[PDB]
Design a protein around this nucleic acid. Structure first.
Ligand SMILES: [Mg+2]
Ligand SMILES: [Mg+2]
Ligand SMILES: [Mg+2]
Ligand SMILES: [Mg+2]
Ligand SMILES: [Mg+2]
Lengths: 219, 62, 49, 143, 197, 58, 36, 102, 27, 38, 134, 128
RNA sequence: GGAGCCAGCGAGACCUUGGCCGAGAGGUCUUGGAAACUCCGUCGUGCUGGGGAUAGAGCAUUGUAAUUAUUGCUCUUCAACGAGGAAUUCCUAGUAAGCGCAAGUCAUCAGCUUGCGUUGAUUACGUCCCUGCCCUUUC
C-alpha cells in the first residue's frame, strides 16, 4: 500500500510544496524554479539568499511544509533536482537532461493552474513503485474529471520523460497541446531522511561504474 | 502657507488605484474639521500631511 | 595521472589533443590495479589532458 | 539595412526586395537625409560649433552626429557608413580619439537642452522670418 | 576613582550633549514646512550616521530614520559602491565641513532646507497625463533621490569630487536657486502637472 | 638623481636635468641592477584535412 | 572646430591563429554529436 | 599660529614649535602667489599664475572648498577681508582688484 | 496536430536537435 | 570502444509521436493514474 | 609598567621608526630604494628614506606580541591580494630586517627556530612605548 | 584561590571569552587595552557598559577578554556582551545580590542585547 | 605607497614548521604528518599615475632528449574600452549587491559546481483599478 511516510496523509490533506535553488542562483534557474512552481499547484517559490540548510529545513518544518524542492544548475542549465519529504524523509535526488523551459518559447502564454490529471507509465519494479509514490503526492488529490490539464511521467530506460499538455475531447478522438517544459529526470540517490542529514541511511543508490551499468534497468 | 492634516483613519475597500490610498485626516488648525484625501505614497493614522488645497474632496480614482 | 582529488582525477599522455578526448568522452577506462573509471571531459589547458 | 551583403536599402537600387519586405519604396530614399546633413554639416554654424544634429530614423532609431564629423560626399560611401552605424551602434575616428556617430536612447527630449524651443516644418503653417524668430527669442534657452 | 581608561575632555563635552560627528548640534534644527515635520526627523541626536537599525521591517520605520543616515544610504549606489556605507559617512562628513565653510549656517540646517525645497508637491500619473498630489514621504524620498543623483552625475567625470558637488547641490537647493539640478527637476515636474491640471 | 619627485617637470634646474641625462645614458656606471634593464598555417591545413575526412565518414 | 574623418570598412563583415581556434570549436563541437 | 610660505608651485605650513613643515599643498599647478589666512584661520586663500584663486580648509589639503577663476591674467594677491569673513579680495595683472564673496 | 507542437507558438532557435540526428541516421 | 554509462536519451520526432500517441491514446479510455481523496 | 601593547598601533611605529633613522645603527641594504616589497605591488615605497626603518619598526613589534617569528610568517603577514592569488611579501627584505634588528640587539635567534625579542630589545621596545605616551 | 568568573559573548561568528577577577581596574582585550580597540568609531560602543554602570565598580577587578571569530563589528558586540556578562556574574558570585540586580536593571534599561544574545534569524516572509 | 587589522566551512613517496640564498619567480638544509576594509601619504579630469590586449628582451620551473614545448617572475611596448539601441530577465531583510576562503566525497561540474564566512542597502510590505489565475451564487 501507500508508503508509511505518506500513508498518514495520503488522500486526506493537500500537500504543501517549497521550491528553492542553490546559493547565488543564475538567472535561468530562477525562471526554471518558477516553472517547477507552476508545475506543482501548491508550490511557492522562495529565494535561497544565504539560507543555511539546517535553517532551511527547520524553518520549513515549523511552517508546516510537506516537501522541499532544491534545484542546481551549471551555467544556467538545470542539472539536478532533489525532493525531500518531511518530517523524516525520504530524500530523492534527480539529474536533469534535455531540459527545455517555457520561457524558451515565443508567445507561449500563461499556464492553467487547475488540478492536473496524472499519468505514470512503465513503472514496474518495487523501486519504480516507490518513485511513483514520491512524485504522486506532490499534487492535490481529486482532480476534476473534466480537467483539461495532464502531466505525464513516462519511464523509458530509467530516463523519466516529463511533459505537460492540455487536451480537448473531440468528436472523434483527443487533441493534446503541449505546454512544456520538457526535461528527462533520472533517479541516482534515495535516502531515508531529510536532505540536510548527510548521514541518513541510503535506501538506494545508483551504481554508475558497474559493468552492467551500460544495460542495467532499475525502474 | 499649506494647510496641515493628521490622519485619523485609513480607509479600506475604497476601490482606489494601485499605489493610491484613500484616508481621512483632521486639520491641525481645527480638530473638528475632517477631510478625505488620496495619498500616492505611504500613510497611516497619526501621521501629518501637507494639503496645498483644503477645499477639494477625494474621489475614487479607479 | 598527474593530479588526484579522491574519485576525480586528471590524466595525461592518453591523447595528443583535446580533439581526441571528445571522441572518447564517457569511455570505459581502468587502472592496472583494476579500479574502473570514465572519461568525463576534456581539459582546455594543456591540450590532450 | 538588409542582407543580399547588408546594403543601405535604397528606393531605386532595391525595388523588388523592399516589395518583398512590403515597405513602400517611395519612403525609402536615404539620399534626402544625406543631402540635408551635407549642407547642414558644411554650414558655417557647424564649423563655428554652435550646431548639433539629431537624426530620428523612421523605424524609431535615434542617432547622434558629432559636429566634428566629415562624412563622404559620395552617396555610395555614405551608404557604407550608415549600414555600419546601425550594426556597431557607433562610429570611431580614423585617429581613434572620439566617437563621431552614436545611436542613443529614445526619447529625444532627455538629450534636448533643459530650456529649449521646439518647432516643425509645416508648409500649411504661417510663414515667419527665421531671423526675426530667433532675434525675438531668448538667449539662455535653445532652438 | 582610578581606572585604566582615561576620558578626554572632548568625550566629556560629548557626554554633555550629543552632536553629529561630535561637531554639530541638532538643538536649533527645525523644518520650515510644518508638514515635512514627522517625516523629516532631526529630533533624535546621533554621533555617527551608522545605526544598524531595522527600518525596512514595517512600511514606515524609514520615516523614523535620521535624515543624515537616509542621505548616507542613498549615496552608496551604482553597484560598485553597494554595501559601502562607511565611505558614504566620510563623504557626508566632508560635505558638512564644506557647507559650513561656504555658509556659516549649520550644514544640517542646510540639508533640511534643501530637502524641504526640492520636494515636489504635485506630480502626474499616466492615464496622457493627469495631475495628482504628492504624499510627504514620497516628497522626502524623491528629494533625497534627486539630490544624490544630481551630486553623483555632476562629479562622475569631473575634477570636482563627490563631496564638494554634493555640498554645492545642497547649498543651491537650500537657497532655492535654479542651479541645483533637483530644483530644476522639481520645477519641471510641477509645471508638467500644471499643464495637465 | 636626488631629485624630489613632487616637483613639476617645468621647474627643473640645469644641473639636475644634466644629472638625469647622465643616469639614463650610464646605468651600469651608477649601479642600476641588470634585471631592471607558417607552422600554425600547417596546423590549420591539417585541421582542414581532418575536417574533410570527417565529412567523408558521413 | 576640429574635423576628423570617419573610420570604416568599405564592405563590412558581420589573426590566423585566432581563426584556427574558431574552426577548432566548430570541428570540436561536431565531434561530441557523433560520439554521442 | 603656524606660518605659511609660498614657494614654487606649492604652499607649506610649518609648525611653530617643531619649526618643520606639517602641511604641503601641491595641487597648485603654476607658480603660487599667496597663502593668506582668514581671521579665524580655518581657511587660507592663494593665487596662481593662471589667475585661478583657490580656497582650501587649513590643515585639510585635499578638499577644494571654493575655486574661482578671477581672470586670465596672473593673480598675485589674495587676501581675506579682516573685518568681514565672507568677502575675499583678489588682485590680478588685469589691473582690476575684484572683491569676491564665498 | 503539427501546428500545436512548438518544440519541433514557436520556439527559440536551437531548441530542437532533429536535423542533426536524422542526418546521423542517414549516415 | 566501451562506455561506462547509459547515453542520454534523445527526443526525436518519432519518439514524440510515440509518446504523444500514448498521451492521447490513454485519454479516450479515461485511464489516469491519479491520487483520489481517501 | 609601560608596554608596546599599551600604545596605539600606528603611533609608536612612526616614533620607533624615527628612532632607528635617528640612531643610524640599523643596516639598510642598497637595494631598498629599487624594490617594491611584493610582486603584487606596482611601485616602490614612496618614503624611500625611511620605509625600511618603518619596515623594521613594524617587524620589531610582531615579535613582541608573538614570541616566535619566522621569515615565512612575515611574508604572509605583509602579503596581500593580487582570480586572486594572495601573493606573500618579498622574502628578501624581511630576512634582512630580521638580521638588521639583531645586529642592534633588538632581537636574536630563538630556540626551535625563529627570532626571540631580546631582553635588551624588549626593554628598548618598552622605552619607545613610553616616550610616545610622555 | 583568587575569586574569578568566566563569561561568553557571541555575535554572529564572533565569540569573546571574558575572565573577571579581583583586581585593580585593569581591562584588556586580546592582550591590549580597551582604549586601543579598533575600529575607533565604534570604540564608544565597547565603552558602553563601563560608562553606564560607572567606572568605580571596575576599579576593584581585572577583566581579560579574548576574541575570536566574526568581523570587526561582530567582535565589538561580542566584547561588550562578554564584559557585561562577566561583570554581572562577578557581582552575583562575590558581591551582594542587590548589586547584580541594579546592574541588570539599569543595563536592560539601556540595551538588552548586551546580555541576551541577538540572533538576526532569517525569516521566510513569503508564506510557506 | 605605507601602516593597522577581523572569518567560518572543511582531513585517503607526497605534504609540511623552521634556517639560509634570490628583487621576484624560485632554489637549498633540516623538523613533524583571506579579501573587501581602517588611518596616514602621492596623482589628479588629461583615454590621466584607469585599462592591461599584442609585441620584444631576459631570469626560473616541469617533464624529455628535444635547442621541444610547458608554467611563473623582471623590464620595456600600451591597444579596444569614455556606461552601452531596438528590446529584454529578475528582485522585498541580513534580501539585492560587493568581498574573499574551503571541498571536488558513484548523477552534473574543473577558473566551473557546491558549501563557508565577511560588508550590507533604496524602494515596496496596500490594492484588486489594468493584466492573469481561481472560489461562491442548496443570481
Ligand atoms: Mg561566488
Ligand atoms: Mg550556481
Ligand atoms: Mg589598500
Ligand atoms: Mg550576489
Ligand atoms: Mg505583498
Amino acid at each position: 500500500q501507500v508508503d508509511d511516510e505518506y500513508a498518514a496523509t495520503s488522500g486526506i490533506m493537500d500537500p504543501r510544496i517549497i521550491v528553492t535553488t542553490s546559493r547565488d542562483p543564475s538567472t535561468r534557474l530562477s525562471q526554471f524554479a518558477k516553472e517547477i512552481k507552476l508545475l506543482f499547484p501548491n508550490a511557492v517559490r522562495l529565494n535561497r539568499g544565504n539560507y543555511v540548510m539546517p535553517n532551511l529545513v527547520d524553518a520549513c518544518k515549523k511552517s508546516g511544509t510537506t516537501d522541499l524542492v532544491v534545484l542546481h544548475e551549471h551555467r544556467g542549465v538545470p542539472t539536478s533536482l532533489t525532493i525531500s519529504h518531511f518530517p523524516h524523509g525520504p530524500t530523492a535526488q534527480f539529474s536533469l537532461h534535455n531540459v527545455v523551459m517555457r520561457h524558451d518559447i515565443i508567445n507561449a502564454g500563461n499556464q492553467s493552474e487547475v488540478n492536473p490529471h496524472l499519468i505514470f507509465d512503465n513503472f514496474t519494479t518495487a523501486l519504480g513503485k516507490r518513485v511513483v509514490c514520491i512524485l504522486k503526492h506532490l499534487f492535490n488529490a481529486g482532480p476534476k474529471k473534466d480537467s483539461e490539464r495532464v502531466i505525464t511521467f513516462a519511464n523509458r530506460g530509467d530516463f523519466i520523460s516529463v511533459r505537460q499538455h492540455v487536451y480537448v475531447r473531440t468528436r472523434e478522438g483527443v487533441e493534446i497541446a503541449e505546454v512544456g517544459p520538457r526535461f528527462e529526470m533520472r533517479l541516482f540517490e534515495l535516502r531515508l531522511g531529510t536532505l540536510e542529514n548527510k548521514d541518513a541511511d541510503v535506501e538506494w543508490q545508483l551504481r554508475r561504474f558497474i559493468r552492467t551499468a551500460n544495460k542495467k534497468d532499475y525502474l | 502657507p499649506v494647510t496641515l492634516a493628521k490622519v485619523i483613519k485609513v480607509l479600506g475597500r475604497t476601490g482606489s488605484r494601485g499605489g493610491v490610498t484613500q484616508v481621512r485626516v483632521e486639520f491641525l488648525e481645527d480638530t473638528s474639521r475632517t477631510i478625505v484625501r488620496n495619498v500616492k505614497g505611504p500613510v497611516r493614522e497619526n501621521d501629518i500631511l501637507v494639503l496645498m488645497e483644503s477645499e477639494r474632496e477625494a474621489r475614487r480614482l479607479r | 595521472p598527474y593530479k588526484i582529488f579522491k574519485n576525480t582525477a586528471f590524466i595525461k599522455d592518453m591523447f595528443s589533443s583535446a580533439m581526441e578526448v571528445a571522441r572518447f568522452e564517457g569511455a570505459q577506462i581502468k587502472t592496472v590495479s583494476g579500479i574502473r573509471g570514465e572519461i568525463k571531459r576534456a581539459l582546455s589547458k594543456p591540450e590532450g589532458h | 539595412t538588409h542582407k543580399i551583403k547588408y546594403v543601405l536599402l535604397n528606393c531605386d537600387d532595391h525595388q523588388g526586395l523592399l516589395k518583398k519586405m512590403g515597405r513602400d519604396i517611395s519612403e525609402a530614399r536615404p539620399d534626402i537625409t544625406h543631402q540635408c546633413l551635407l549642407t547642414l554639416l558644411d554650414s558655417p554654424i557647424n564649423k563655428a560649433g554652435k550646431l548639433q544634429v539629431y537624426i530620428q530614423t523612421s523605424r524609431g532609431i535615434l542617432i547622434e552626429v558629432n559636429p566634428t564629423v566629415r562624412i563622404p560626399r559620395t552617396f555610395k560611401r555614405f551608404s557604407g557608413l550608415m549600414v555600419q552605424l546601425l550594426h556597431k551602434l557607433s562610429i570611431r575616428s580614423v585617429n581613434s580619439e572620439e566617437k563621431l556617430l552614436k545611436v542613443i536612447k529614445n526619447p529625444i527630449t532627455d538629450h534636448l537642452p533643459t530650456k529649449c524651443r521646439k518647432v516643425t516644418l509645416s508648409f500649411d503653417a504661417p510663414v515667419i522670418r527665421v531671423q526675426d524668430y530667433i532675434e525675438k527669442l531668448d538667449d539662455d534657452e535653445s532652438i | 576613582v582610578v581606572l585604566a581608561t582615561p576620558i578626554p575632555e572632548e568625550v566629556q563635552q560629548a557626554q554633555t550633549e550629543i552632536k553629529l560627528f561630535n561637531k554639530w548640534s541638532f538643538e536649533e534644527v527645525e523644518v520650515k514646512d510644518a508638514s515635512l515635520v514627522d517625516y523629516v526627523q532631526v529630533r533624535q541626536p546621533i554621533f555617527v550616521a551608522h545605526t544598524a537599525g531595522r527600518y525596512a521591517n514595517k512600511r514606515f520605520r524609514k520615516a523614523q530614520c535620521p535624515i543624515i543616515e537616509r542621505l548616507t544610504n542613498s549615496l552608496m549606489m551604482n553597484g560598485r559602491n553597494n554595501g559601502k556605507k562607511l565611505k558614504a559617512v566620510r563623504i557626508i562628513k566632508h560635505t558638512l565641513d564644506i557647507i559650513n565653510v561656504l555658509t556659516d549656517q549649520n550644514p544640517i540646517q542646510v540639508v533640511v532646507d534643501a530637502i524641504t525645497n526640492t520636494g515636489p508637491r504635485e506630480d502626474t500619473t499616466r492615464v496622457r497625463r493627469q495631475a495628482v498630489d504628492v504624499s510627504p514621504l514620497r516628497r522626502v524620498n524623491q528629494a533625497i533621490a534627486l539630490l544624490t543623483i544630481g551630486a553623483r552625475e555632476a562629479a562622475f567625470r569631473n575634477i570636482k569630487t563627490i563631496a564638494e558637488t554634493l555640498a554645492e547641490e545642497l547649498i543651491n537647493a537650500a537657497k532655492g536657486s535654479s542651479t541645483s539640478y533637483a530644483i530644476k527637476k522639481k520645477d519641471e515636474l510641477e509645471r508638467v502637472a500644471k499643464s495637465n491640471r | 638623481a636626488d631629485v624630489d619627485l613632487h616637483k613639476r617637470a617645468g621647474e627643473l634646474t640645469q644641473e639636475e636635468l644634466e644629472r638625469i641625462v647622465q643616469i639614463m645614458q650610464n646605468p651600469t656606471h651608477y649601479k642600476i641592477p641588470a634585471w631592471f634593464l607558417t607552422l600554425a598555417n600547417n596546423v590549420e591545413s591539417k585541421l582542414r584535412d581532418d575536417l574533410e575526412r570527417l565529412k567523408k565518414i558521413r | 572646430i576640429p574635423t576628423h574623418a570617419p573610420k570604416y570598412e568599405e564592405n563590412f563583415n558581420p589573426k590566423m591563429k585566432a581563426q584556427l581556434k574558431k574552426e577548432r570549436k566548430f570541428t570540436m563541437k561536431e565531434i561530441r554529436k557523433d560520439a554521442k | 599660529h603656524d606660518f605659511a610660505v609660498t614657494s614654487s608651485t606649492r604652499v607649506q605650513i610649518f609648525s611653530s614649535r617643531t619649526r618643520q613643515v606639517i602641511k604641503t599643498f601641491s595641487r597648485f599647478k603654476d607658480v603660487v602667489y599667496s597663502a593668506s589666512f582668514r581671521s579665524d584661520g580655518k581657511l587660507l586663500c592663494a593665487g596662481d599664475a593662471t589667475g585661478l584663486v583657490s580656497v582650501y580648509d587649513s590643515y585639510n589639503p585635499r578638499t577644494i572648498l571654493l575655486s574661482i577663476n578671477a581672470s586670465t591674467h596672473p593673480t598675485h594677491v589674495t587676501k581675506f577681508h579682516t573685518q568681514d569673513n565672507k568677502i575675499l579680495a583678489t588682485a590680478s595683472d588685469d589691473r582690476v582688484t575684484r572683491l569676491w564673496d564665498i | 496536430r503539427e501546428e500545436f507542437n512548438p518544440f519541433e507558438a514557436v520556439g527559440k532557435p536551437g531548441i530542437s536537435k532533429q536535423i542533426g540526428e536524422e542526418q546521423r541516421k542517414r549516415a | 570502444f566501451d562506455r561506462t554509462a547509459k547515453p542520454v536519451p534523445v527526443i526525436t520526432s518519432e519518439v514524440t509521436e510515440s509518446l504523444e500517441d500514448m498521451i492521447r491514446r490513454r485519454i479516450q479510455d479515461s485511464n489516469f493514474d491519479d491520487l483520489q481523496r481517501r | 609598567g609601560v608596554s608596546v601593547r599599551d600604545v596605539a598601533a600606528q603611533d609608536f611605529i612612526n616614533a620607533y621608526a624615527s628612532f632607528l633613522q635617528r640612531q643610524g645603527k640599523l643596516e639598510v641594504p642598497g637595494y631598498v630604494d629599487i624594490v617594491k616589497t611584493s610582486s603584487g605591488n606596482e611601485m616602490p615605497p614612496q618614503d624611500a628614506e625611511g620605509w625600511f626603518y618603518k619596515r623594521a619598526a613594524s617587524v620589531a613589534r610582531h615579535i613582541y606580541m608573538r614570541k616566535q617569528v619566522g621569515v615565512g610568517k612575515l611574508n604572509k603577514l605583509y602579503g596581500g591580494a593580487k582570480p586572486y592569488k594572495h601573493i606573500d611579501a618579498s622574502g628578501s627584505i624581511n630576512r634582512k630586517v630580521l638580521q638588521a634588528l639583531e645586529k642592534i640587539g633588538i632581537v636574536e635567534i630563538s630556540p626551535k627556530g625563529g627570532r626571540r625579542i631580546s631582553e635588551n630589545g624588549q626593554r628598548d621596545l618598552d622605552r619607545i612605548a613610553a616616550q610616545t605616551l610622555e | 584561590a583568587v575569586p574569578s568568573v568566566q563569561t561568553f559573548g557571541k555575535k554572529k561568528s564572533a565569540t569573546a571569552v571574558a575572565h573577571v577577577k579581583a583586581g585593580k581596574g585593569l581591562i584588556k582585550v586580546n592582550g591590549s587595552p580597551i582604549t586601543l580597540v579598533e575600529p575607533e568609531i565604534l570604540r564608544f560602543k565597547v565603552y558602553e557598559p563601563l560608562l553606564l554602570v560607572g567606572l568605580d565598580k571596575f576599579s576593584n577587578i581585572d577583566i581579560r577578554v579574548r576574541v575570536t571569530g566574526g568581523g570587526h563589528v561582530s567582535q565589538v558586540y561580542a566584547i561588550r556582551q562578554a564584559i557585561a556578562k562577566g561583570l554581572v556574574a562577578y557581582h552575583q558570585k562575590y558581591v551582594d545580590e542587590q548589586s547584580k540586580n541594579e546592574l541588570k536593571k539599569a543595563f536592560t534599561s539601556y540595551d538588552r542585547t548586551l546580555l541576551i544574545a541577538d540572533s538576526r534569524r532569517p525569516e521566510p516572509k513569503k508564506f510557506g
